[PDB]
Design a protein around this motif. Structure first.
Motif, PDB file in Angstrom:
ATOM      1  N   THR A 108       0.829  -1.206   0.000  1.00  0.00           N
ATOM      2  CA  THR A 108       0.000   0.000   0.000  1.00  0.00           C
ATOM      3  C   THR A 108       0.872   1.269   0.000  1.00  0.00           C
ATOM      4  O   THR A 108       0.737   2.137  -0.889  1.00  0.00           O
ATOM      5  CB  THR A 108      -1.013  -0.014   1.157  1.00  0.00           C
ATOM      6  OG1 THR A 108      -1.965  -1.065   0.927  1.00  0.00           O
ATOM      7  CG2 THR A 108      -1.768   1.316   1.263  1.00  0.00           C
ATOM      8  N   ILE A 109       1.785   1.390   0.958  1.00  0.00           N
ATOM      9  CA  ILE A 109       2.617   2.601   1.028  1.00  0.00           C
ATOM     10  C   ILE A 109       3.705   2.625  -0.063  1.00  0.00           C
ATOM     11  O   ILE A 109       3.835   3.605  -0.809  1.00  0.00           O
ATOM     12  CB  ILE A 109       3.243   2.747   2.431  1.00  0.00           C
ATOM     13  CG1 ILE A 109       2.154   2.921   3.497  1.00  0.00           C
ATOM     14  CG2 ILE A 109       4.204   3.959   2.486  1.00  0.00           C
ATOM     15  CD1 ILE A 109       1.229   4.143   3.276  1.00  0.00           C
ATOM     16  N   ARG A 143      -2.160   9.107   0.677  1.00  0.00           N
ATOM     17  CA  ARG A 143      -1.735   7.943   1.458  1.00  0.00           C
ATOM     18  C   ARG A 143      -0.953   8.334   2.712  1.00  0.00           C
ATOM     19  O   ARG A 143      -1.104   7.706   3.758  1.00  0.00           O
ATOM     20  CB  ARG A 143      -0.886   6.994   0.601  1.00  0.00           C
ATOM     21  CG  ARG A 143      -1.678   6.261  -0.450  1.00  0.00           C
ATOM     22  CD  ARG A 143      -2.554   5.153   0.140  1.00  0.00           C
ATOM     23  NE  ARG A 143      -3.283   4.487  -0.929  1.00  0.00           N
ATOM     24  CZ  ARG A 143      -4.589   4.586  -1.142  1.00  0.00           C
ATOM     25  NH1 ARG A 143      -5.357   5.315  -0.341  1.00  0.00           N
ATOM     26  NH2 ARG A 143      -5.133   3.930  -2.163  1.00  0.00           N
ATOM     27  N   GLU A 146      -3.386   9.539   5.269  1.00  0.00           N
ATOM     28  CA  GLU A 146      -4.025   8.382   5.891  1.00  0.00           C
ATOM     29  C   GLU A 146      -3.115   7.680   6.909  1.00  0.00           C
ATOM     30  O   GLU A 146      -3.539   7.328   8.021  1.00  0.00           O
ATOM     31  CB  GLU A 146      -4.500   7.410   4.798  1.00  0.00           C
ATOM     32  CG  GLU A 146      -5.697   7.975   4.008  1.00  0.00           C
ATOM     33  CD  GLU A 146      -5.829   7.440   2.593  1.00  0.00           C
ATOM     34  OE1 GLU A 146      -5.019   6.597   2.149  1.00  0.00           O
ATOM     35  OE2 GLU A 146      -6.768   7.862   1.888  1.00  0.00           O
ATOM     36  N   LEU A 147      -1.855   7.472   6.538  1.00  0.00           N
ATOM     37  CA  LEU A 147      -0.918   6.818   7.438  1.00  0.00           C
ATOM     38  C   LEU A 147      -0.660   7.655   8.693  1.00  0.00           C
ATOM     39  O   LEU A 147      -0.581   7.137   9.809  1.00  0.00           O
ATOM     40  CB  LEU A 147       0.410   6.555   6.708  1.00  0.00           C
ATOM     41  CG  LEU A 147       1.479   5.837   7.537  1.00  0.00           C
ATOM     42  CD1 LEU A 147       1.028   4.438   7.934  1.00  0.00           C
ATOM     43  CD2 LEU A 147       2.812   5.771   6.782  1.00  0.00           C
ATOM     44  N   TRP A 150      -3.641   7.623  11.048  1.00  0.00           N
ATOM     45  CA  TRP A 150      -3.749   6.381  11.757  1.00  0.00           C
ATOM     46  C   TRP A 150      -2.674   6.258  12.861  1.00  0.00           C
ATOM     47  O   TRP A 150      -2.962   5.805  13.980  1.00  0.00           O
ATOM     48  CB  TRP A 150      -3.752   5.199  10.777  1.00  0.00           C
ATOM     49  CG  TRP A 150      -3.963   3.945  11.511  1.00  0.00           C
ATOM     50  CD1 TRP A 150      -5.151   3.322  11.785  1.00  0.00           C
ATOM     51  CD2 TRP A 150      -2.947   3.184  12.150  1.00  0.00           C
ATOM     52  NE1 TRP A 150      -4.923   2.204  12.546  1.00  0.00           N
ATOM     53  CE2 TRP A 150      -3.576   2.105  12.791  1.00  0.00           C
ATOM     54  CE3 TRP A 150      -1.561   3.320  12.258  1.00  0.00           C
ATOM     55  CZ2 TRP A 150      -2.862   1.147  13.513  1.00  0.00           C
ATOM     56  CZ3 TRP A 150      -0.867   2.376  12.975  1.00  0.00           C
ATOM     57  CH2 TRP A 150      -1.510   1.305  13.585  1.00  0.00           C
TER      58      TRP A 150
END
Ligand SMILES: N[C@@H](CCC(=O)N[C@@H](CSCc1ccc([N+](=O)[O-])cc1)C(=O)NCC(=O)O)C(=O)O
Ligand SMILES: N[C@@H](CCC(=O)N[C@@H](CSCc1ccc([N+](=O)[O-])cc1)C(=O)NCC(=O)O)C(=O)O
Lengths: 213, 213
Positions: A108-109, A143, A146-147, A150
């Motif tokens: 994903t990353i 992204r 988002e990371l 979180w």
């Protein structure tokens, strides 16, 4: 039990910055206190049919230990983490989530980072360079948003330092030269927390010694 | 022990072809004989803050079972394979190599495929479309050459059918529409061997039922 041997570039294209994929493997070995050896490959050697017996796509790193030959930096880190203590938690629920974050780092990353750095570095002077750059940058920032959201104030991704942090930090370090992480204070601090660990320094100094040899 | 619940598209953009990343998870569950449930998400629902508690990047699939919430199709397949029989071998050496191929499917083969299909499908009518297409296609064919040579006459990647084959076949199926696999007879036959398994059909029929609901 024989020490493992890993393949690495003889002359790494990373300028000694520890960004090639042997780095997470070296770091994992240093975290668990496993002595290891390296086999340096020239660019020409990596393309020879003999290297394919170790890495079927002619890339580094591979890992050899007795009869066992492995490839894939993520899978090599997994193997190290499964047979030593200190990189995967014992509790089964926590362990499964740690493995989720190992895959997230790489699936994903990493693709969002590489889609950007490929355009940024490899595709200048063939438009719409700046245009394709803007698109991949937008997807990357999303992204990272988002990371970052979180992660919050967590020290590490899943409780204690783990193999997920090794893979995630090595992926994020591909952004150091771009300065993009300066806009994500908690991600920058997270990367720095990993880089300050003594095992990280032992791994980094070893790849640097290959570079300066 | 409660059955797990996985998130899936309410209206999948794949036309019912089972190409979204819930497919390898469904297939793994069917191979081990674990009943499961789905939660269908609209595109709008996937972007809501509530979904982030399950998948931090607002994507599918996630997996929920009691207190355990997982994400990453690769890690979900890993978890299923670790706690049932039939997807990972017992022998430790063979197991480590199976995990290597799980990572290779997602971190070596998949990026070469997606770099191509992204240009091929999403970037027409903005040149040099055909030029960027040619470059990604060349890199893809090289990786398929390498995978094909390595596979030879093997039925599966690592001895018996495994979680690596689930991930690798689902990745390779993204090339069906392009016809590229027709030039790689052993890879085509490999994909067809997987598609002929009864668990594959049970998983495929289930995603199709969501589509035709
Ligand atoms: N999925 C594999 C991918 C392995 C891979 O990409 N290996 C690269 C080296 S790390 C990737 C990399 C390259 C350069 C830098 N750099 O900073 O210059 C950083 C990372 C390689 O061997 N490349 C040579 C080739 O393809 O011929 C894994 O994770 O092990
Ligand atoms: N690394 C994650 C990646 C998850 C992911 O990419 N999910 C996609 C669905 S599968 C990828 C996919 C999409 C479409 C097709 N297709 O054929 O149309 C196939 C596969 C998603 O939720 N996308 C919606 C969004 O980003 O908003 C994993 O493997 O679980």
């Amino acid at each position: 039990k024989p020490n493992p041997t890993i393949t690495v570039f003889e002359r790494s294209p990373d300028g000694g910055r520890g960004l090639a994929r042997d780095m997470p493997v070296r770091w994992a070995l240093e975290e668990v206190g496993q002595p290891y050896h390296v086999r340096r490959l020239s660019f020409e050697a990596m393309k020879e049919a003999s290297h394919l017996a170790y890495q079927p796509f002619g890339q580094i790193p591979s890992y050899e230990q007795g009869d066992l030959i492995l490839f894939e930096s993520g899978a090599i880190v997994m193997h190290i983490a499964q047979h030593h203590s200190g990189l995967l938690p014992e509790d089964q629920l926590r362990r499964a989530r740690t493995v989720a974050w190992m895959f997230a780092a790489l699936n994903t990353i990493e693709p969002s980072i590489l889609n950007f750095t490929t355009v940024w570095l490899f595709e200048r002077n063939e438009p719409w360079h700046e245009a394709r750059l803007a698109r991949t940058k937008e997807q990357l920032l999303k992204r990272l948003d988002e990371l970052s959201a979180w992660l919050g104030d967590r020290e590490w991704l899943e409780g204690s330092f783990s193999a997920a942090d090794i893979l995630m930090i090595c992926v994020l370090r591909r952004l150091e030269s771009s300065g993009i992480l300066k806009d994500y204070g908690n991600l920058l601090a997270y990367v720095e927390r990993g880089k300050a660990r003594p095992a990280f320094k032992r791994a980094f100094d070893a790849q640097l010694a290959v570079f300066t040899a």
